[PDB]
């Protein structure tokens, strides 16, 4: 019993980490394999990032340029290449620690952990989820770029984020791993307003679920609703419209508790509309979104 | 900017994982140098656990009887020794992975992170505290023993505690590395109340100067007070008491925002009075006590 914001182990991650230098510029590296992947402002100086030109500012770049420490020891670049906003190092060394891995391009809702790091070496692990808007709602600091975000089923790493920037909002946007921005992004230091961030409601539904397997049960009322009348109040809730994919992700949960997953959206249509009056769910006073369905099945059933 | 429930990089505690397997009960131990550390209670079927002698029960125990397991290879045992609650199991092999360790006992209000394994596999990591009652709020399953807690200071890995029991209560109970429990807790399935579970005021006040450091400001009211005024307060809220080291543990942070230590418990005696008015610290509805004022320093200022 217990219910924690867990993040994966991070060990197949740190022994990707590397650094990356370009002339005063460092940054965190990802070496999957003889390729070492890094934000592609990497090459810019601070006035650069006001209004860059990617390719023109590449042009002034040699493979000699990029400066690629694993460890305390230095790696040859033999390529350079620039896919989106990334930039892919090819180093004349395999990583021996390369795990196995993909790369994945999340949707908005999904959760995964990310490995801060300041130059090429960890120093954290957090759990957090893409939210509606691309955003993300992270710890980074200046130098946390190229830190990368994933998911790990068994053996294999699904490698899912990439840091780059920070909106002037303090929250936080990045690429996939083939250097695609998440949301309407520019790796640029210009004002980027993020859209509304909605509450990630079959994550809620899970967190719901996942507070009644672990004896938090005072919130479970008497009612039902529908999906369309569920729907209407999560609208005037900034929550995100519930479909029948998510009644569906939701099955083994309302099958393990037996609370069908309409008499759980009755339940949070209620705390939406009452609040909580001063009382918590699985220690959180407000209702958590960064839990997906499948979180819940795997912490709650001690997935390695 | 931003500001997340942050656990240590789990690889070097990753590598020290194995899976210790005595009659037909499994858990985990912690393999560093040529010693496996575990719960002593590996050697008790389910009907022991009531009411075990736990010197009787080791006699019927050889080291053959300890099946230790690293990855998919069996670790040879030597030696066996019960230290107070965990059993030390000698094995021929000198951990390879054993990284820079110390064993420390931690005092209640410290956080640290934990690896929770099952079958000496990783499931994931996350961030607590030894609560003022000695108890952890964890997330455990049954086969999640000899998980450990550790916080990492550049090389060295410092244990502190390692998973044995969970309460009737659904909350958890351990040792350090030496075997002693924390609190007044016994290795044996017996009904055990907690005690009070008071709010770790130094580690929220470290957290209101986090949130003031990441924008959050609104909760700065126009107040001052006295250390004896703020702890009648934290009586009257099941806060713990105040004191100079805690002030002087504050200094830092107080120093960088400028807020005076006494300036922020008057904004936090006024959050205990008032409550939030349905507002958001640092994306939580609550007074956050898990993170002490090292982890805002260390966090807000990116060591590795
Ligand atoms: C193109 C250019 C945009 C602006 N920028 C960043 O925002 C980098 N960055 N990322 N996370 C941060 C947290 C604190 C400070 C800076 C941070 C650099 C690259
Ligand atoms: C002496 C004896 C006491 C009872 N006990 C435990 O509580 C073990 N344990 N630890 N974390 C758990 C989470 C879920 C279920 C069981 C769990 C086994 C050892």
Redesign the interface.
Known sequence: ???????????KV??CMVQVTCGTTTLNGLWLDDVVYCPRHVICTSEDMLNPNYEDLLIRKSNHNFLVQAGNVQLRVIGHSMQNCVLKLKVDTANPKTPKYKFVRIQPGQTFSV?????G??????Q?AMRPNFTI?????N??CGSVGFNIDYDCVSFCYMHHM?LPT???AGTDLEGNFYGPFVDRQTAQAAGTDTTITVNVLAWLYAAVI??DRWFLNRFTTTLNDFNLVAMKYNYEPLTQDHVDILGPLSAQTGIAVLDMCASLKELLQN??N?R?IL????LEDEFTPFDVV???????
């Open positions: 019993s217990g219910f924690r914001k867990m993040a994966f182990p991070s060990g740190e022994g490995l801060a790091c300041y130059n070496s960890p120093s954290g692990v957090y957090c709602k992270g710890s980074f600091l130098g946390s920070e303090g929250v936080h672990n004896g609040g909580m001063g918590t220690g959180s006073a407000l795997r912490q709650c059933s001690g997935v390695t």
